[PDB]
């Protein structure tokens, strides 16, 4: 039960996707947001394309990647920021965390338009190593990018 | 499938008076009873899970203000048992393992996983003072099976940063072999 | 040219597979030991089996996990420790580094029969998250638990 | 009837010096003699009252600087003697006593007046770090018996603030009793 | 015409990891090995300069940072050697002597001279408390035999200031002769 959140996007050898769906206990507790305090969890699917640059393998998911969210409701003009945590799921590993719309205390996050952007950056900001080799070794890590996609939220599911 | 407990007390006459108490409460052997310094009782029992939480309860419920300190270790291989108590036999001298941790707690979690994580025969383990201060696991088998028993007994201890040293010894002297079997 | 070490094992709904190769040249810099002064490159191999129990989709790689490792020569009786760093290269990602053998100052890492043991933790130490709801949650967090693997160093490839 | 005299020197070389010369001083039997922390000597005579006094009179004159402490006890229970030095035989297992005390000196007297206090037979005393660290006495035979010894010992170290701890232990385990018997 | 060698570790483990190496690295005979306070420990091997040389070469350069101190006594008398790894048969009684010097080192030193210098028998060496504690030699001989040995190792500790006593005991009592023994 996903609702899909605008198109998907091809760029940098991942197909990056978005999906909204009902809340979800994330643990441990005390670092994403409470179920109870949350309307819908935002998750991003993130998955290597066919001949990826990074030497990774079509279908694998992307670890270890900073990407942070930013959802503005078009209709009202309020606009919230936030990160997203990597955790996995039934349905396999991905990025995602709870988000409050209409039990937003600030409110304007209510049912309506809204446009969501990615930000997402290098995995070599967070440890991560790529071999550099002549034999086994590979390009370059994309530089830091924002992705857009436009959807319309039909209230917590 | 076997448990360890810890007792510590600050008399000597209590830490022998709640020696009596815990043995007749539940079924458990003595594993260790002596003093330490400077005037202090060190007690360590073994058996049941449910037997060494009963008794570490009973033992610590008695203890009063001379309590210093309280420990159980679960899922315990029990070739350990009778290594921190004495000596098990040793008819191979080819080869032995040596891993020495900060604390009794951290030497006792590695020789359980390097028993359990090998096929090396655990001679013995030591105390040198207290169960706050060095000890020491003694293995003994074949090469291949002392490194693997080190390796993992050394990654178990270095995880609390207690390890102060690992040495796997083959082919040990006539004179190292008696050091190592006394 | 990847040299394989002892047999691979099934666990925790993973298999972890450990192989030495030519050392590899890693970005960032200062991190993973140089490769002109290391011999050989430990990779393990974690791959997600069937109906694995953390959601895992089969034949994706195990992510955010931390793993410890400790090769002993049983010839010399030397026994050195260290980390494996998360890395990605042609063959895909996995969690590699450059490890010093006969060019070891310490000496007793040469050609021989060797003993390979990791220490595996939950990647719960590392932040990753987990549902737990009841449509698209998933089981525990394997506890930390050790392998062993033999192998003879046939020395630097 | 008897007598205990203690003797500590701050030299391991004079200690056993004094100890030659005390022993060939008098008629008295060496109970105790070992080097004590960090670098210390310890060293324990028994026998008459007269014999015991002329020993550590001569022990302390020729001491120097080299003493550290001394100390005789007087009238003391023929059974401590042994009891110090070794261990007493005990065939019964009935029932045992443990009354730890501070300073040997206290653990002496408290031990000296339990014996003859009592039917109870007195096993052992140890000093476990020198005369002046904690001491303990042990003490067997029936139920009744040791309850009183250990009652009386009580009294005798807790008037001087020095008792550490009593415990009465009946039936004792096998493991235990053992332990305590041997020590 | 041989020696003894002494290596001091910080770690236990490493002590006996070296213990191995160098016994391995030469043809020299283990005299000590034990854990000192508070968690070091201490190995004395003994054997030809050149063996004692290059094992405690060995041992130094494997020590690493867990190296507490490292020392070589060369020309040292044959008689010391068993009597630091155990003890040297005592059937004479004529006369007893007992030497305490600060360290083992002085101790070594003083006994090699006083042996050299007399015939009299050295029935052992014993170290109360590591290398850095007090120590103490024993000999036995005729009397004017025990004395000389005296007199020369308290000359050779004195010159250094770390003499503690000296005592020549003559026809020792039989309860200390057997503690002189035993001990």
């Known amino acids: 039960g996903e609702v899909p959140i605008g198109d998907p996007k091809e760029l940098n050898g991942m197909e990056i996707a978005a999906v909204?769906?009902?809340?979800?206990?994330?643990?441990?507790?005390?670092?994403?947001?409470a179920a109870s305090l949350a309307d819908i969890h935002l998750e991003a699917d993130i998955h290597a394309l066919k001949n990826n640059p990074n030497g990774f393998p079509e279908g694998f998911w992307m670890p270890y990647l900073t990407i942070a969210?930013?959802?503005?409701?078009?209709?009202?003009?309020?606009?919230?920021?936030?990160?997203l945590m990597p955790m996995v799921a039934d349905d396999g590993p991905h990025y995602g965390a709870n988000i409050a719309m209409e039990k937003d205390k600030k409110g304007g996050f209510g049912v309506g338009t809204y446009a969501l952007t990615f930000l997402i950056s290098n995995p070599e900001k967070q440890g991560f190593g790529r071999?550099?080799?002549?034999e086994t070794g590979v390009g370059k890590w994309f530089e830091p990018f924002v992705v857009t996609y436009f959807f319309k939220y039909t209230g917590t599911p | 499938?076997?448990?360890?407990?810890?007792?510590?007390?600050?008399?000597?006459?209590?830490?022998?008076?709640?020696?009596?108490?815990?043995?007749?409460?539940?079924?458990?052997?003595?594993?260790?009873?002596?003093?330490?310094?400077?005037?202090?009782?060190?007690?360590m029992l073994g058996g049941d899970i449910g037997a060494?939480?009963?008794?570490?309860?009973?033992?610590?419920?008695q203890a009063g203000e001379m309590l210093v300190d309280s420990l159980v270790l679960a899922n315990i291989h029990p070739s350990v048992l009778p290594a921190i108590s004495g000596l098990n036999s040793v008819d191979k001298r080819q080869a032995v393992g040596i891993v020495e941790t900060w604390s009794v707690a951290a030497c006792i979690s590695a020789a359980d996983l390097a028993v359990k994580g090998s096929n090396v025969t655990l001679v013995r383990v030591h105390m040198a003072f207290g169960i706050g201060g060095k000890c020491y696991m003694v293995v003994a088998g074949d090469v291949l099976d002392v490194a693997a028993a080190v390796a993992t007994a050394s990654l178990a201890a270095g995880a609390k940063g207690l390890l102060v040293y690992a040495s796997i010894i083959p082919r040990p002297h006539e004179a190292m072999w008696r050091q190592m079997v006394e």
Chains 1, 3 share one sequence.
């Open chain 1, 69 to 83: 969210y930013a959802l503005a409701n078009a209709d009202t003009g309020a606009i919230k920021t936030g990160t």
């Open chain 2, 52 to 61: 060494i939480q009963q008794a570490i309860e009973t033992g610590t419920s």
């Open chain 1, 20 to 33: 909204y769906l009902q809340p979800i206990e994330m643990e441990p507790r005390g670092i994403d947001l």
């Open chain 2, 1 to 43: 499938s076997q448990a360890i407990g810890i007792l510590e007390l600050t008399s000597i006459a209590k830490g022998m008076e709640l020696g009596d108490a815990m043995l007749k409460s539940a079924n458990v052997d003595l594993l260790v009873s002596k003093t330490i310094s400077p005037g202090k009782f060190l007690l």
């Open chain 1, 131 to 134: 071999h550099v080799d002549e």
